[PDB]
Structure 1
Amino acid sequence: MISGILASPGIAFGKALLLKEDEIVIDRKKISADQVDQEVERFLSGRAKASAQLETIKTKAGETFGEEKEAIFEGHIMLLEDEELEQEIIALIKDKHMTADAAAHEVIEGQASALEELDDEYLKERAADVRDIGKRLLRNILGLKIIDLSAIQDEVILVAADLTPSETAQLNLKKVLGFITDAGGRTSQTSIMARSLELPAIVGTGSVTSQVKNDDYLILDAVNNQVYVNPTNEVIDKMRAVQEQVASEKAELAKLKDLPAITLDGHQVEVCANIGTVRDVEGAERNGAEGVGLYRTEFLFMDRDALPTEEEQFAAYKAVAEACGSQAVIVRTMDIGGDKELPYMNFPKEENPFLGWRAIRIAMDRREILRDQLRAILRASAFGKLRIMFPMIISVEEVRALRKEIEIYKQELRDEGKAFDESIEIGVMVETPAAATIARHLAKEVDFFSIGTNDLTQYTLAVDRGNDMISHLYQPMSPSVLNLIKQVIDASHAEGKWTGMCGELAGDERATLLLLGMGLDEFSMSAISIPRIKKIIRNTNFEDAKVLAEQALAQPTTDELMTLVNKFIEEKT
């Protein structure tokens, strides 16, 4: 009668793998001065190994799982090589004459210990990944046998007292038919993977590993929450039928699913990822993005040491369009020239880059840039739903000149026997107070708007997004920016178009009810913000938010508008 917390429902049959380790012994014996130089070298020599061995694990994650898991190792490796650790680890040994395994443990444990003080389950899990890096470092200095979970040649079930984030990367998902551990619970990194991977697994067994030996045959019910050890065929049978039900359940659920970001009372909005690079599509899918709301094409340009030609752009766009499957990508034409220069362009310096020769102002002074790019986007639209959107729009003049441009580039494509989506929709960033002001006029001329509040805030308040000295004045949650937001949304709706938002406000927990109440159609953010905002959306009543929004829009003061938001959150969920 053994029961755990069951993190993923399902059924499985296979052999049991047991991870046996040698308790990490730490010597608290003080070292002499002559041993100070030797201990540092041992740390560097031991650190020298993990450096190369950690790199080997990274390459396996990229080929095995992809770039989504490959970069996590770079962060762990980059954090390990942090110059702060080198000076802090060496200082304690040199200053306190402590051992490298005891001194190094304090440094990584010290930071992770600070993270645990946090009162958040999400921050605590990351502290688990950081703790794992130091835990293996001690083995690396001592030189402990590395079982390595990658050396699995046969399908088996994975059983362990607890797994550290480092093992999950170099873990064979195809050869592991499930995961069973006695860790704490869902707050365990590996436990979250079972949920997302959708594979049967337990994490609160409590003491199954002490009852299982390697090569043991076990059947996981993950339905009755029971484990059969060397059971006859009468149980191997029941289970097999339990597994049938499980499979039928999928088959039935497989029909319809649910509705996207929808308030309690039925109001739907889109919620999408802003991206920079195909590589960001992974995070977007991971975080439940319903499409891409802003594809900052600059970022692709800073992903290279030369200006990407029509063809390179096309390919890059095609990949994205395809890595997005059915989903729509809003490809913004290039926005170089505020805090985002590309050095390879060698553009001249400006007194105020953010009020300078930025984005569209360049592509219009150098048509080859605008042309290659729009050409490339159009052509890529033959391969997935793309939209075109323009940055730094300031006038109706600009929009007409660029549409006219599109139309020219469209014909050329037609003439060169090159498909493009003839349906392709065109919109504009509203991220200038100009644009916001003439929103009505612009709304006749485009299919949609996305409000860039980073910029809009910047120009409306004349506060440089980069300038920490006045950051306290950078308030996208001003009665001034909100009003301009409303005015834009309304413009959209008056023409029967829609406004999205890719500025950081979309992703800001504190604006979500207002953005919603004000009728924003689409939110686009860092992928990581998608769930927080989705959550807020799913738990609001839309009508209430309207009332909230309206109130907020009448406040002459941020504080006063923050108050409304807060009393709402108090009274309303």
Structure 2
Amino acid sequence: MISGILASPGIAFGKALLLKEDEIVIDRKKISADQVDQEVERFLSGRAKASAQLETIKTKAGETFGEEKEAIFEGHIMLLEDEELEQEIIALIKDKHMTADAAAHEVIEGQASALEELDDEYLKERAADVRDIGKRLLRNILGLKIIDLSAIQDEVILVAADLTPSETAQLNLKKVLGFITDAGGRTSHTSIMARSLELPAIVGTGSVTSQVKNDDYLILDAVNNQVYVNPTNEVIDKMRAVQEQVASEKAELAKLKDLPAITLDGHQVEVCANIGTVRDVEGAERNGAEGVGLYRTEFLFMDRDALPTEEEQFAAYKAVAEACGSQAVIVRTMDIGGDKELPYMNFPKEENPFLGWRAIRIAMDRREILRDQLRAILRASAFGKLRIMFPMIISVEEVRALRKEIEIYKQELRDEGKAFDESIEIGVMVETPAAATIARHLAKEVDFFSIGTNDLTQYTLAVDRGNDMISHLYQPMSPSVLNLIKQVIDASHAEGKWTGMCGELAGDERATLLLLGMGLDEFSMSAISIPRIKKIIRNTNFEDAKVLAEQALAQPTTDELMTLVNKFIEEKT
């Protein structure tokens, strides 16, 4: 009867691999002066190896996982070569006549020890990565035999007390049919990989490695949360059928709108990622995004030290469109100028950037910007489902002037023998109280809306998103912002269009029932929030939420509206 936390559901059958590591012996024997010069050379000679061996691991991470994991090694390597460590490690040996393995341990342990004093779980984990660098350094000076998880010639299950980020890079994903460890829990780096990799694995076993020997045959239920050791065929069979169900579950979920973004009583919404860069598509796919709800194109502009031309934009958009496969991306035209300047533009300062010459106000005062970009988006739409959406819309005037612009850019493309999706849908950010107010009018003029609650909150409450001194007044969960949200959604629906939401409220656990009840069609968020919200959605009853929403919309006070939400959560799941 062994149970863990189960990080990924599924089933698997294979041999068990056990990572055994010998304890590192440290000699506290003081060294003589003649040994001072020799110990430094041993450290440099031992450090010389890890230098080249660490570099080899980096290259495997880049090809195996990508640049996201390749740079983490550079930080560890760059930190190791820090000139502060060279002087501090040598000084103790030269000054205290200590050994290199004992003196070096104090330096890396000293810094990591300072990090543990921190009262944050996020800073403590990084201290674990730093500690790992010094831990291996001691083995490197001694020249301890390394197992290396890359030397696997046969498929096996991976069992260990805990895995350090360094092992996950040089790990064979195809030869490992799963991962099992007794680490702390999801807060473990390897645990997150099981989720994104979508492979069965446990991390809270507690003491399975002490019960398993290498070459042991084990079957992972990852469904009943049980492990069978050398079990007959009656269990190897049950499991095999459990694995069948698992596979059918995929096959069914595989359907289009038949996704978890459905309440108990059958109400579906989209749930998507906001992104900045192709690189974010990875997190989106990892977290179960059904498409991209907001492609903040600014971020691509701050990914460069020059304004990206039509061609550079096109390429960037094309990549995204393609890295998204079948999925739709809502490409927002550029929003520079509140707290998001791009320095390379050298725009002049403003007294209130957030009430200033922002986003569309620029692209309309400098058509080359609007034109290059819209041109690029359109052209990229020849390569995947894209939508166009505009930021900082304030009037019907603005929308018509920009549609007219699209139509001009569309013809030019037609005339230059350049495909673009003629179906391409156009919408607007509703993130201004103006837009919210004339939502009915705007809804005739666009295909859709996405409510930017970060901004909407900001202007409706006149509280600067940046200003910590008044942060306590920044409440997107005000009777004032909610009402304006409702009013927008309703506008959508009255024209037979839809409203999504890319403001942070979409991703906020506390609004999910209200957003849902109020009929929001689409949620778009940081990818990392997709599962929390999906979970809430999948476990609500939609009808109940409507009732909730309605109540909340009548409250003159946030507190009073928080109460409704809470009594709901109490009574309803």
TMscore range, shorter length: 0.7 to 0.9
Q: CA deviation at 1:384?
A: 0.9
Gap change, CA 1:52 and 1:535, over 3 Å in 2: farther
Q: CA deviation at 1:550?
A: 2.4
Gap change, CA 1:180 and 1:565, over 3 Å in 2: closer
Gap change, CA 1:493 and 1:175, over 3 Å in 2: same
Q: CA deviation at 1:316?
A: 0.8
Contact 1:7-1:202 within 8 A present in 2 as well: yes
Contact 1:15-1:156 within 8 A present in 2 as well: yes
Q: Match of 1:270?
A: 270
Other structure's SS at 1:218 match: strand
Other structure's SS at 1:9 match: coil
Bigger mean CA offset, 487-496 vs 296-305: 487-496
Q: CA deviation at 1:539?
A: 2.0
Q: CA deviation at 1:500?
A: 1.0
1:63-96, CA deviations, whole angstroms, 9 ceiling, x for partnerless residues? 1123454466577779989999999999999999
1:276-298, CA deviations, whole angstroms, 9 ceiling, x for partnerless residues? 00000000011111110100001
Contact 2:64-2:169 within 8 A present in 1 as well: no
Q: CA deviation at 1:8?
A: 6.3
Contact 1:260-1:269 within 8 A present in 2 as well: no
Q: CA deviation at 1:329?
A: 0.4
CA-based RMSD: 4.9
Q: CA deviation at 1:272?
A: 0.7
Gap change, CA 1:394 and 1:236, over 3 Å in 2: closer
Other structure's SS at 2:73 match: helix
Bigger mean CA offset, 92-101 vs 193-202: 92-101
- Partner Cα distance (2:38, 2:342) in 1: 46
Q: CA deviation at 1:398?
A: 0.8
Q: CA deviation at 1:555?
A: 2.6
Gap change, CA 1:28 and 1:491, over 3 Å in 2: farther
Gap change, CA 1:409 and 1:129, over 3 Å in 2: same
Q: CA deviation at 1:131?
A: 6.3
Gap change, CA 1:552 and 1:368, over 3 Å in 2: same
Contact 1:133-1:166 within 8 A present in 2 as well: no
Contact 1:14-1:157 within 8 A present in 2 as well: yes
Other structure's SS at 2:206 match: coil
Gap change, CA 1:343 and 1:98, over 3 Å in 2: farther
Q: CA deviation at 1:98?
A: 10
Q: CA deviation at 1:120?
A: 12
Gap change, CA 1:58 and 1:507, over 3 Å in 2: farther
- Partner Cα distance (1:371, 1:530) in 2: 33
1:184-207, CA deviations, whole angstroms, 9 ceiling, x for partnerless residues? 677755455445535455667777
- Partner Cα distance (2:306, 2:341) in 1: 13
Written as runs of structure 1 = structure 2, the 5 A alignment for 1:20-59 is 20-25=20-25, 56-59=56-59
Contact 1:68-1:282 within 8 A present in 2 as well: no
Other structure's SS at 1:393 match: coil
Bigger mean CA offset, 502-511 vs 553-562: 553-562
Other structure's SS at 2:562 match: helix
Gap change, CA 1:133 and 1:441, over 3 Å in 2: farther
Gap change, CA 1:437 and 1:12, over 3 Å in 2: closer
Q: CA deviation at 1:440?
A: 1.3
Q: CA deviation at 1:557?
A: 2.6
Q: Match of 2:416?
A: 416
Contact 1:67-1:279 within 8 A present in 2 as well: no
Contact 2:338-2:358 within 8 A present in 1 as well: yes
Gap change, CA 1:48 and 1:487, over 3 Å in 2: farther
Contact 2:382-2:420 within 8 A present in 1 as well: yes
State the percentage of identical aligned residues: 100
Gap change, CA 1:463 and 1:448, over 3 Å in 2: same
1:487-509, CA deviations, whole angstroms, 9 ceiling, x for partnerless residues? 21121112111111111111112
1:167-188, CA deviations, whole angstroms, 9 ceiling, x for partnerless residues? 1222111233444555567775
Gap change, CA 1:270 and 1:26, over 3 Å in 2: farther
Q: CA deviation at 1:150?
A: 2.9
- Partner Cα distance (1:48, 1:452) in 2: 53
Gap change, CA 1:481 and 1:59, over 3 Å in 2: farther
- Structure 1: gaps spanning 5 or more residues: none
Contact 1:178-1:199 within 8 A present in 2 as well: yes
Is residue 2:165 matched to residue 1:165?
yes
Bigger mean CA offset, 283-292 vs 264-273: 264-273
- Partner Cα distance (1:61, 1:182) in 2: 24
- Partner Cα distance (1:437, 1:32) in 2: 82
Bigger mean CA offset, 98-107 vs 317-326: 98-107
- Partner Cα distance (1:377, 1:522) in 2: 22
Q: CA deviation at 1:158?
A: 3.4
1:513-545, CA deviations, whole angstroms, 9 ceiling, x for partnerless residues? 222222211111111111111122222222222
Q: CA deviation at 1:341?
A: 1.4
Other structure's SS at 2:493 match: helix
Q: CA deviation at 1:551?
A: 2.6
Gap change, CA 1:280 and 1:31, over 3 Å in 2: farther
Q: CA deviation at 1:256?
A: 8.4
Gap change, CA 1:255 and 1:301, over 3 Å in 2: closer
Bigger mean CA offset, 333-342 vs 556-565: 556-565
Bigger mean CA offset, 24-33 vs 69-78: 24-33
Bigger mean CA offset, 220-229 vs 269-278: 220-229
Bigger mean CA offset, 376-385 vs 80-89: 80-89
- Structure 2: gaps spanning 5 or more residues: none
- Partner Cα distance (2:502, 2:537) in 1: 17
Q: CA deviation at 1:266?
A: 2.1
Q: CA deviation at 1:165?
A: 3.1
- Partner Cα distance (1:12, 1:488) in 2: 48
Bigger mean CA offset, 375-384 vs 234-243: 234-243
Contact 1:68-1:283 within 8 A present in 2 as well: no
- Partner Cα distance (2:149, 2:227) in 1: 23
1:215-249, CA deviations, whole angstroms, 9 ceiling, x for partnerless residues? 77888788999999999999999999998998788
Other structure's SS at 2:379 match: helix
Q: CA deviation at 1:157?
A: 4.4
Gap change, CA 1:501 and 1:39, over 3 Å in 2: farther
Contact 2:257-2:268 within 8 A present in 1 as well: no
- Partner Cα distance (2:34, 2:535) in 1: 59
Q: Match of 1:439?
A: 439
Contact 2:272-2:525 within 8 A present in 1 as well: yes
1:409-442, CA deviations, whole angstroms, 9 ceiling, x for partnerless residues? 1111111111111111100111112111211111
Gap change, CA 1:401 and 1:157, over 3 Å in 2: same
Contact 1:128-1:165 within 8 A present in 2 as well: no
Gap change, CA 1:102 and 1:401, over 3 Å in 2: farther
Q: CA deviation at 1:332?
A: 0.3
Contact 1:261-1:270 within 8 A present in 2 as well: yes
Gap change, CA 1:502 and 1:83, over 3 Å in 2: farther
Gap change, CA 1:215 and 1:344, over 3 Å in 2: same
Bigger mean CA offset, 246-255 vs 33-42: 33-42
